Design a protein around this ligand. Structure first.
Ligand SMILES: CCCCNC1=N[C@@H]2[C@@H](O)[C@H](O)[C@@H](CO)O[C@@H]2S1
Length: 668
């Protein structure tokens, strides 16, 4: 499965052996990065004057003058041919030759090659990744791995813009990088060049920029330093800011000044990109004129980025038509998937879909904003690379499977199982959701409806659920020990542990359904409760970021199935035996009475779940920080003390009981 799929392909039912003796034509004049890849593939074979001909070079070179009319006349295009007599690897330009060898490398299976003719080129000019998220920036080693991945998948753009890099954003965008960071960026630029990737260094000055000479000069001086480090593409971001920095005329004047005094003055600057303040249709104000001002004033060679109809959205024909008409040029898409920085307790490992496949001519570029988990993001990155190169032939599911098999060939089926059930975002303020667990959701829905109603569930549905949990356990345990992509496994391990616990819980709940005698049922009930406690422990000790701490997995279909099945069968047990087993589905060490709203623990906070439509007792005495609501305290539940106020400080007073958003913060 060639990825990305080439524009034009003709295969014959004949196989050629990678010649033991070959004659290289054009190795001295072709793209060195391409030649280097080719010599690596021919490492065990000898190069004599006889033997199979191998012609590599760019259009205009002597080596490929024969095939000049076969080479597509598109940037980054190439012509590739293999037959029993000769191999041709001919780019329309140097990057095309490199892309011919990236395809050539996929065709080489077991030392054999298919007899094939290929004419290929990208439908979208700029394709790649923007490290543009909030959270821990990708490590240096992660970024190096990313750049080699991009070259392999014909992504030619990497836009560096981590929101939390202090030399990228306010206020220290004015300061040059220290020497250590600068040397790293220098290495990144070189590795990008060797993999045929434009390294675009972005700056995010909007929150405190002054529209004066001083800050203009500092931004240009910063761009000059980055240029001395090797950077040849630049971006200015005005996203997620307030104040004077949002002025579209001033933004356009600044970008045009950079364009005329820097971008066009250097000999060798490629991309110049900006992000507007109103960067999706819903944030555009029809009472004003922001987008048409940038469209008219900004020099036309400058790119303008866009996320679609909403902050998080997929690109439609009507949507891109809407923006293009206003910015007077094809939008450069910033696609906010798989970025998870607003649902940080979820991994987003599902397929890439939703974007119209017929609108390649309507966009200048297409980049994905990924997760702070770099390796995990390669599933979506690989798929975007395929979509962007050949959208007409974009195959969502086959590309997702191909990505997984490329990233983790030693355990591809196990990663597919995990990713299949780790793709929805859960409820969130952007309203963006993805499908998850589609394969088993019909059997889960049938089983639960029947069980709740007292009707016989279908045996096949019960067995599908049993199979699912068994496979999840297998997949979790195999993934934990996989050593082929250790950085990937480091990233996902907390979710893999939670995933296994979910599967164990689901198995034990199904045995309660199979429930044969009272003592067996009780053992399973006690086991389930302990597993709930273990999932709480992981949720409280892993991924403790300040915004969405913890680890959630299989949230769309499976955890609701298990929670609801457990609650139902415990109700049935209590009815049958006149018992009073607790049917709560998530462990909570603290207690609340009055509401069935569950309490939640997040970091050092104890909170009542908000709802759409009271006494808290903690498991110990803690020093109190504050209580926030949108009021009495005690340590023994007998002697109380009132607190005035919504908000109220506790001043480290001992707290075990509270009585009256509803959140208590305590010291730890
Ligand atoms: C139009 C291109 C700029 C879009 N910029 C965005 N900035 C924020 C990003 O840093 C976040 O990662 C993204 C997802 O939360 O939301 C918005 S989208």
């Amino acid at each position: 499965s060639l990825q990305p799929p080439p524009q034009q392909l003709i295969v014959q039912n004949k196989t050629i052996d990678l010649p033991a003796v070959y004659q290289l034509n054009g190795g001295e004049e072709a793209n060195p990065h391409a030649v280097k890849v080719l010599k690596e593939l021919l490492s065990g074979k000898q190069s004599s004057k006889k033997g199979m001909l191998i012609s590599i070079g760019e259009k205009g070179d002597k080596s490929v003058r024969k095939y000049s009319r076969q080479i597509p006349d598109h940037k980054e295009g190439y012509y590739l041919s293999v037959n029993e007599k000769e191999i041709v690897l001919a780019g329309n330009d140097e990057r095309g030759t490199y892309y011919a060898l990236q395809t050539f490398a996929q065709l080489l299976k077991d030392g054999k090659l298919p007899e094939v003719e290929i004419k290929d080129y990208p439908s979208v000019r700029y394709r790649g990744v923007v490290e543009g998220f909030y959270g821990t920036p990708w490590s240096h080693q992660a970024r190096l791995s990313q750049l080699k991945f991009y070259g392999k998948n014909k992504m030619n753009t990497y836009i560096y813009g981590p929101k939390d890099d202090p030399y990228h954003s306010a206020p220290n965008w004015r300061l040059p990088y220290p020497d250590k960071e600068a040397a790293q960026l220098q290495e990144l630029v070189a590795v990008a060049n060797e993999n045929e990737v434009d390294f675009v260094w972005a700056i995010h000055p909007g929150q405190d920029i002054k529209w004066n000479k001083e800050d203009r000069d500092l931004l240009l001086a910063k761009f000059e330093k980055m240029y001395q480090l090797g950077v040849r593409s630049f971006a200015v971001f005005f996203d997620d800011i307030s104040g004077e920095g949002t002025n579209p005329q001033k933004q356009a004047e600044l970008l045009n000044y950079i364009d005329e005094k820097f971008a066009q003055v250097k000999p060798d600057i490629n991309q110049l990109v900006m992000c507007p303040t109103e960067y999706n249709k819903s944030w555009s104000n029809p009472n004003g004129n922001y987008l048409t001002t940038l469209g008219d004033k900004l020099n036309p060679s400058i790119q303008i980025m866009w996320t679609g109809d909403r902050v998080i959205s997929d690109i439609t024909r009507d949507g891109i038509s809407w923006i293009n008409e206003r910015i007077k040029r094809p939008a450069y898409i910033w696609w906010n998937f798989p970025v998870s920085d607003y649902v940080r307790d979820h991994l987003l490992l599902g397929p890439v879909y939703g974007n119209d496949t017929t609108i390649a001519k309507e966009m200048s570029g297409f980049v994905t904003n990924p997760m702070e988990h770099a390796e995990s993001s390669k599933i979506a990155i690989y798929s975007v690379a395929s979509y962007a190169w050949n959208p007409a032939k974009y195959d969502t599911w086959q590309t997702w499977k191909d990505a997984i098999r490329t990233i983790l060939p030693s355990a591809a089926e196990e990663l597919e199982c995990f990713a299949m059930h780790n793709s929805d975002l859960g409820p969130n303020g952007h309203g963006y959701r993805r499908e998850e667990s589609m394969d088993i959701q019909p059997a889960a829905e049938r089983f639960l409806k029947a069980f709740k109603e007292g009707k016989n569930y279908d045996k096949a549905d019960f067995e599908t659920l049993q199979y699912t949990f068994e496979r999840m356990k297998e997949s979790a345990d195999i993934l934990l020990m996989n050593t082929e992509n250790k950085p990937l496994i480091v990233e996902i391990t907390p979710w893999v542990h939670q995933f296994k616990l979910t599967a164990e819980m689901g198995e034990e709940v199904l045995k309660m359904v199979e429930g044969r005698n009272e003592s067996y049922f009780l053992r399973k009930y006690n086991h389930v409760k302990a597993l709930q406690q273990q999932m709480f422990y992981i949720d409280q000790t892993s991924n403790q970021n300040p915004y969405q701490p913890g680890v959630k997995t299989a949230t769309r279909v499976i955890k609701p199935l298990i929670d609801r099945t457990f609650a139902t069968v415990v109700k049935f047990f209590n009815q049958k035996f006149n018992a009073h087993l607790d049917a709560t589905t998530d462990y909570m060490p603290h207690k609340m009475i009055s509401k069935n709203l569950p309490l939640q623990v997040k970091a050092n906070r104890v909170l009542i779940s908000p709802a759409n439509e009271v006494e808290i007792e903690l498991d110990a005495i803690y020093p109190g920080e504050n209580i926030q609501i949108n009021l009495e305290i005690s340590t023994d539940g007998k002697e109380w003390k009132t607190v005035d106020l919504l908000s109220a400080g506790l001043q480290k007073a001992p707290v075990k009981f509270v009585r009256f958003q509803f959140v208590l913060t305590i010291e730890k």
